[PDB]
Structures are given as C-alpha cells and as structure tokens.
Amino acid sequence: FSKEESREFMAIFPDIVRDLTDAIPEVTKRFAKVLQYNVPTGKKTRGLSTVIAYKMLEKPENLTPENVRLAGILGWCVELLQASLLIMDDLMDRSETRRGQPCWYRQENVGFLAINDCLHVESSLYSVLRKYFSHLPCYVPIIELFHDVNFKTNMGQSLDALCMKDGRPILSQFTMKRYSSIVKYKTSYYTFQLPVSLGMYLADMYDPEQHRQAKTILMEIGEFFQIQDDFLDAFGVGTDIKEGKCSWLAVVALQRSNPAQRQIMEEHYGRPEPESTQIIKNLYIELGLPATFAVYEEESFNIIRTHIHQISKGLPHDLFFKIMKKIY
Amino acid sequence: SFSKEESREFMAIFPDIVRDLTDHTDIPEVTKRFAKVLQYNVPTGKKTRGLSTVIAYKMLEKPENLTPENVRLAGILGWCVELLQASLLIMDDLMDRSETRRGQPCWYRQENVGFLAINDCLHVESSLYSVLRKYFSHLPCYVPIIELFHDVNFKTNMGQSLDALCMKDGRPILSQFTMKRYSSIVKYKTSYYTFQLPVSLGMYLADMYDPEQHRQAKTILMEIGEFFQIQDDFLDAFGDSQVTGKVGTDIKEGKCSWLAVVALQRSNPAQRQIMEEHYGRPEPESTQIIKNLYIELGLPATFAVYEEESFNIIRTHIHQISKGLPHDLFFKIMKKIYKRDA
Numbered sequence: 001f002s003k004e005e006s007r008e009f010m011a012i013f014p015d016i017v018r019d020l021t022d023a024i025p026e027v028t029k030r031f032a033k034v035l036q037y038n039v040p041t042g043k044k045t046r047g048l049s050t051v052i053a054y055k056m057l058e059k060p061e062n063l064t065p066e067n068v069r070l071a072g073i074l075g076w077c078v079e080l081l082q083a084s085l086l087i088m089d090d091l092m093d094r095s096e097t098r099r100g101q102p103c104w105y106r107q108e109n110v111g112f113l114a115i116n117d118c119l120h121v122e123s124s125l126y127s128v129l130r131k132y133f134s135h136l137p138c139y140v141p142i143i144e145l146f147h148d149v150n151f152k153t154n155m156g157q158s159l160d161a162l163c164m165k166d167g168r169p170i171l172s173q174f175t176m177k178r179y180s181s182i183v184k185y186k187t188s189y190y191t192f193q194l195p196v197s198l199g200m201y202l203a204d205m206y207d208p209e210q211h212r213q214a215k216t217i218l219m220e221i222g223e224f225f226q227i228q229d230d231f232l233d234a235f236g237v238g239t240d241i242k243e244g245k246c247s248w249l250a251v252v253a254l255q256r257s258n259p260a261q262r263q264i265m266e267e268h269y270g271r272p273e274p275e276s277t278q279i280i281k282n283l284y285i286e287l288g289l290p291a292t293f294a295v296y297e298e299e300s301f302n303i304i305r306t307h308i309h310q311i312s313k314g315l316p317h318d319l320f321f322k323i324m325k326k327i328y
Numbered sequence: 329s330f331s332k333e334e335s336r337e338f339m340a341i342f343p344d345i346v347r348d349l350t351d352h353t354d355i356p357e358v359t360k361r362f363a364k365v366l367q368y369n370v371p372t373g374k375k376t377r378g379l380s381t382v383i384a385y386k387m388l389e390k391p392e393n394l395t396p397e398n399v400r401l402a403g404i405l406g407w408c409v410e411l412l413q414a415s416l417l418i419m420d421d422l423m424d425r426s427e428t429r430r431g432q433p434c435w436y437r438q439e440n441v442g443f444l445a446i447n448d449c450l451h452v453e454s455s456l457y458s459v460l461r462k463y464f465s466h467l468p469c470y471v472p473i474i475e476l477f478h479d480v481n482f483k484t485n486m487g488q489s490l491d492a493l494c495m496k497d498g499r500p501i502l503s504q505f506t507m508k509r510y511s512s513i514v515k516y517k518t519s520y521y522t523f524q525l526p527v528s529l530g531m532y533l534a535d536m537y538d539p540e541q542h543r544q545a546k547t548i549l550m551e552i553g554e555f556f557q558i559q560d561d562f563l564d565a566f567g568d569s570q571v572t573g574k575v576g577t578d579i580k581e582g583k584c585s586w587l588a589v590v591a592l593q594r595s596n597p598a599q600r601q602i603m604e605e606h607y608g609r610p611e612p613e614s615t616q617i618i619k620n621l622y623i624e625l626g627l628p629a630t631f632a633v634y635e636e637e638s639f640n641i642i643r644t645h646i647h648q649i650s651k652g653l654p655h656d657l658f659f660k661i662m663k664k665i666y667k668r669d670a
C-alpha cells in the first residue's frame with residue numbers, strides 16, 4: 001500500500017487512456033472523460049494487488065521493467081471491470097456519491113447514458129488484454145477468468161437484489177448463509193480471486209489445484225474484509241441502514257433480537273427518516289455488536305492465519321499475509 | 329432459406345443453452361431467476377441473426393463437413409449472437425424509455441426489476457462466453473470467435489454512445505443531423521453485430537481466416553446494415569406496434585433517425601422551425617406535430633423509393649462480390665428483410 005507502489009501503477013494510466021481512445025471522434029473524446037472520472041478513483045487496491053501478486057509469484061529473473069508493467073496493465077483491467085460494476089451499482093441503488101464524487105449517472109448530460117458507459121468500460125478491458133497478452137500462453141486463461149468472474153459478480157448482484165422488494169428489505173432473507181453467498185459472488189471473486197489468479201497466470205502458473213488452494217483462503221479473506229467494512233459503516237457518513245443493506249450487522253442483530261427488537265428492525269431498517277437510522281444504531285449498541293465484532297475478528301484472523309500456513313502446491317505464504325495485513 | 333424446418337432446428341438448441349447457464353449449486357435462487365431472465369429476453373425475437381449464422385456456415389462449409397454435430401455448433405454460435413442481441417435490447421429499452429419489446433412490457437418495467445435490468449444486461453452478455461468455452465474451446469476458431477465478439481461488443485457500445493449524443497440539455501443538435509453522422513451511428517450501432525458478426529462466425533467455423541474474404545463480406549454487409557436500420561427508423565414512426573411488437577420513441581428521444589435527417593434535408597424554413605420547437609420533447613402532442621410534418625413532407629413515399637432503389641443497388645453490388653463468397657447467402661439475407669413490417 002506504499003506511495004511508490006501507487007505512483008508506479010498511476011504512471012501506466014495515461015497509456016490505458018491512449019490505448020482505449022487515441023491509439024467517430026466525439027464518442028472517443030467523451031470516453032476519455034468516462035475513463036478518467038470513473039477508473040482511477042479510490043485507492044486502486046485491486047489493481048495494486050494484481051501487481052504485488054505477480055511480483056511475489058514470478059521468477060526474479062523474469063521481473064523486468066517490461067513484465068512488471070504488464071502486471072500493472074492487468075491491474076488496470078481489474079480497475080476497468082470494477083469501474084463498470086460501480087457505475088451500474090450506483091444506478092441500481094440510486095446513490096448520490098461514491099468516494100466523495102457524484103455518481104457518474106448524476107453528472108450533467110449523462111443520466112441513462114451511464115448504462116451504455118457501464119457496458120463500454122467493461123468491453124474496453126478485452127481490447128487492452130488483446131493488445132498486450134494475445135501472443136502469450138496466459139491469454140486464453142486470463143480472458144476466461146475475466147468472463148467467469150464477471151458472470152459470478154452479476155449472480156452476486158442479483159442475490160443481493162433478492163433481499164429487497166418494493167423498496168423495502170426482506171428481513172426473512174437476512175440469514176448468515178445468504179450473506180456469505182452474496183459476499184462470495186458479489187465481492188470476493190473480483191476483489192481477491194481475480195487479482196491473485198491473474199498474477200499466477202502472468203507468472204505461467206496454471207495448476208488448477210494451485211488456483212483452488214488460493215481461492216479457498218481468498219474467499220475467507222474476502223468474507224472478513226466485507227464484515228469489517230459492514231461493521232465500520234455504522235461504528236467506524238455510513239448509509240447501509242438507510243439503504244436497507246443485507247449487512248453483517250443487520251444479519252447478527254436479527255440472530256440476537258427478541259420479538260420486540262425484531263419488530264424495531266421490521267419498522268425502522270431501510271427507512272430514510274432520520275429517527276429510523278438512530279433507532280437501529282441504538283439497537284446495534286444495545287445488542288453489543290462492536291464487542292461481538294471484536295471476538296469474530298480475533299477468531300477469523302487465527303483461522304485464516306492457520307489456513308495460509310497450510311497452503312500446499314508450492315505457493316508463497318508471504319503473498320496472502322501481505323494481502324491479509326492490508327485488510328486487518 | 330429461413331424455412332420452418334431451419335427455425336425448429338435452431339429453437340431445439342435453446343433449452344440446452346438455458347441448462348448450460350443455470351444447471352453454482354449454493355445459490356439456486358439466482359440460477360432459477362437467470363433461467364427466467366433468459367426465457368423472457370432471448371428467444372421471442374425473429375432470430376434472424378441466429379438463423380443467419382447457421383445459413384452462412386451451411387453455404388460456406390464444404391458439403392462433406394456439414395454433419396449434424398457441425399450444423400448444431402453453428403446453431404450454438406447463432407444463440408451466442410442472440411444472447412448479445414438480448415443483452416443490447418434490455419439496456420436499449422431502459423435508455424430509450426420504451427414501453428414494449430417483442431409484444432410484451434420491456435424487461436426493466438417488470439415489477440421488481442427497474443435498474444436491476446442493467447445487471448441482467450451485463451449477465452446475459454457474460455453468459456455467451458460460458459457457452460463459447462463449453463463448445464468451442466478445443467477448436468482452432470475459438471480465439472478468433474472470442475476476439476470477434478469482444479471487438480463487435482466494443483464497437484456496438486461506441487455506436488450506442490454516438491446514438492445517445494443526439495440530445496444535450498434536453499434539445500436535439502439538429503445542425504449535426506447529417507447523412508454522414510447517420511451512416512457512422514448505424515455502422516457501429518447495428519451493422520457490425522447484426523450482419524458482419526453472423527457471417528464472420530460462419531466463416532470462422534468453416535476455418536476461413538483470409539482477411540480479404542472477411543473484407544469483401546464486410547463491404548456488402550455494411551450496406552445491408554444501413555438499409556436494415558433505415559427500415560427500423562421508418563417502422564418507429566409509421567409501423568404498427570401490434571406487428572413490430574414495440575412502441576416507437578425516436579421523435580420523443582430526439583434521435584438522429586433517417587426520418588429526422590431526410591426531414592431536415594427536405595424542410596423549408598417554416599418546417600425547420602417546427603423541428604427546432606417540437607423534436608425531442610416528452611409531450612405527446614409534440615410527437616404528433618413531428619409525425620404530421622413527416623407526412624406533409626411525403627417521407628412514407630420517400631422511404632418506399634429509397635427501399636426499392638437500395639434493394640436494386642445492393643443486389644447489383646452482390647453480383648460484383650468476388651473472393652469465393654456465395655452470392656446466394658447475401659440475396660437470401662436481402663430477400664428476408666426487403667419490405668419487412670417488423
């Protein structure tokens with residue numbers, strides 16, 4: 001997560017913009033604006049994770065400036081996929097802002113054009129893959145991984161939507177089993193599996209059992225990341241309560257609620273009125289969810305640490321500890 | 329040919345496509361929902377793109393190679409084009425604020441869909457690559473086919489963006505509504521995915537990779553594509569929604585349609601000022617004032633002359649096709665769409 005790692009990664013971004021525009025002009029001019037607004041925002045943890053994965057998997061003699069740059073181009077393809085997913089999500093959730101910026105669809109003379117922009121950005125990453133990877137053995141595996149992860153992410157987004165009806169949350173749907181499945185499909189595949197598997201393919205590591213071993217730990221890391229994120233939304237302005245999100249806090253609240261407290265969740269969860277958010281926050285404090293999170297965090301850390309030490313098939317343990325360090 | 333027999337053969341593959349994409353055993357709620365998404369959105373069209381893929385292959389491949397298995401592969405490729413079509417229409421209806429598609433309420437208008445249609449759009453598009461992986465991953469044509477879908481997808485998104493830049497600040501950019509702009513929109517928005525994609529897929533499955541052969545096909549199929557979209561633009565204003573299965577929104581959405589471009593070419597100053605005032609308005613009475621102007625300018629008659637003359641011009645260009653391309657494939661495509669009312 002160092003400043004020098006960020007600068008190395010950002011140095012590639014102008015080339016990505018040139019590749020997808022310069023390299024019908026009013027569309028290409030506009031698309032340069034789409035890319036610069038939506039793609040290089042946030043901390044770029046997923047793109048940087050792709051570069052770090054490659055650096056810790058590849059043979060030192062192969063870690064040339066050229067090959068490290070290729071890993072960066074792969075990282076930007078992950079950031080292109082994310083940008084597409086978040087443009088769509090912000091449209092679907094009718095959100096006002098993301099990471100301090102207005103949601104792309106809310107910008108002047110965007111509106112419903114954000115729908116095509118979402119698909120355009122997703123489509124663009126396969127142009128980048130063709131330009132830089134078409135001559136390599138990792139080309140087809142990388143293409144198939146992106147298509148597979150995109151499909152799985154759409155399945156996650158749909159499962160998330162099946163926890164809401166007529167603008168209200170369906171609290172009967174808020175089970176730990178459904179929560180775990182939403183996090184796995186909607187977040188963990190594209191956030192954790194995709195960067196590491198891309199690093200492995202670029203380092204010409206194709207053993208399916210290596211990818212399966214990596215997947216097992218990265219799905220556990222992914223679940224912790226999202227539970228910590230859900231916790232910090234309320235206790236870390238967080239809008240999960242107002243939005244009626246199937247968050248870990250809401251799932252555990254319903255597990256620990258008596259009938260009177262279940263009725264409070266029924267009446268007040270996913271309501272825009274200021275009194276509702278405050279009533280839910282008060283209930284979360286009353287149910288001792290911060291204390292419950294602290295216990296979960298310790299147990300999960302020790303289980304994941306143990307599982308990383310057990311990773312077989314000659315994978316570097318240090319890669320998973322560096323990722324797991326960044327989360328915790 | 330586009331016969332009942334060919335249609336039955338093609339439709340028979342659809343259940344296998346749904347099974348392949350839905351039957352992730354830890355999330356059965358979502359896999360069953362996706363079966364519904366596919367059943368609603370994919371197979372109730374005319375399926376001309378899908379059937380065109382099969383016909384292209386059958387006329388390009390060496391007769392001895394046309395096994396039941398190889399003809400079914402062409403059919404599966406056809407359904408991959410129909411999956412792309414399905415995803416584009418889901419997204420398009422949301423963007424074009426449309427009421428009906430293929431005789432039914434648009435997917436996004438279904439009670440608890442709305443903007444979730446954007447996710448279903450991305451999902452259906454992604455799904456075609458799973459189908460390609462299952463059936464084509466072991467064949468030499470796999471990477472060319474993947475790269476064609478990728479490139480056509482990208483080009484179509486570019487076309488849809490140029491189509492959507494018809495308006496800024498709620499008013500149409502009528503000064504920019506030229507036949508040059510129109511030809512650019514339709515080439516990227518329609519021609520590549522509707523005509524080039526099916527034929528190129530047929531060529532690739534028949535292991536025909538000669539770039540000159542693809543370039544020869546491209547030249548004619550871009551002409552056929554423009555013709556097809558001009559027909560679609562006409563049906564938007566003057567078609568029967570009971571036959572087309574859709575309600576037109578081009579006037580209301582201020583689209584750079586063939587009708588709008590030709591109307592501005594034929595308009596006197598007073599008629600130009602009616603377009604300036606009433607084109608691209610949400611009010612229904614403004615849509616009627618534009619349709620009235622189209623009628624007064626004789627655009628129905630102008631369209632009929634264009635369609636007949638273009639049919640003859642394209643048929644003349646098909647006769648001049650070289651590079652061992654079967655002329656009859658292109659005649660069959662033009663015969664299928666000439667004077668269509670849907």
Ligand SMILES: C=C(C)CCOP(=O)(O)OP(=O)(O)O
Pocket residue numbers: 085086089090093095157186187
């Ligand atoms: C990858 C996708 C689809 C983003 C989902 O984010 P959520 O809607 O759950 O939460 P926000 O990041 O919008 O707060």
Ligand SMILES: C=C(C)CCOP(=O)(O)OP(=O)(O)O
Pocket residue numbers: 372373374375376413430518522557560670
């Ligand atoms: C490119 C355009 C005009 C979209 C509709 O295509 P069709 O008119 O072929 O639609 P379906 O048969 O698939 O319903």
Ligand SMILES: C=C(C)CCOP(=O)(O)OP(=O)(O)O
Pocket residue numbers: 416417420424484488517518560564574
């Ligand atoms: C990329 C696509 C789907 C082309 C749609 O063009 P239109 O917007 O004119 O299509 P219809 O709604 O008339 O079917």
Ligand SMILES: [Mg+2]
Pocket residue numbers: 089090093095
């Ligand atoms: Mg959201």
Ligand SMILES: [Mg+2]
Pocket residue numbers: 089092093160
């Ligand atoms: Mg969401």
Ligand SMILES: [Mg+2]
Pocket residue numbers: 229230233
């Ligand atoms: Mg959050």
Ligand SMILES: [Mg+2]
Pocket residue numbers: 239
């Ligand atoms: Mg948010």
Ligand SMILES: [Mg+2]
Pocket residue numbers: 420421424426
């Ligand atoms: Mg439309």
Ligand SMILES: [Mg+2]
Pocket residue numbers: 420424491
């Ligand atoms: Mg449209």
Ligand SMILES: [Mg+2]
Pocket residue numbers: 560561564
């Ligand atoms: Mg139309």
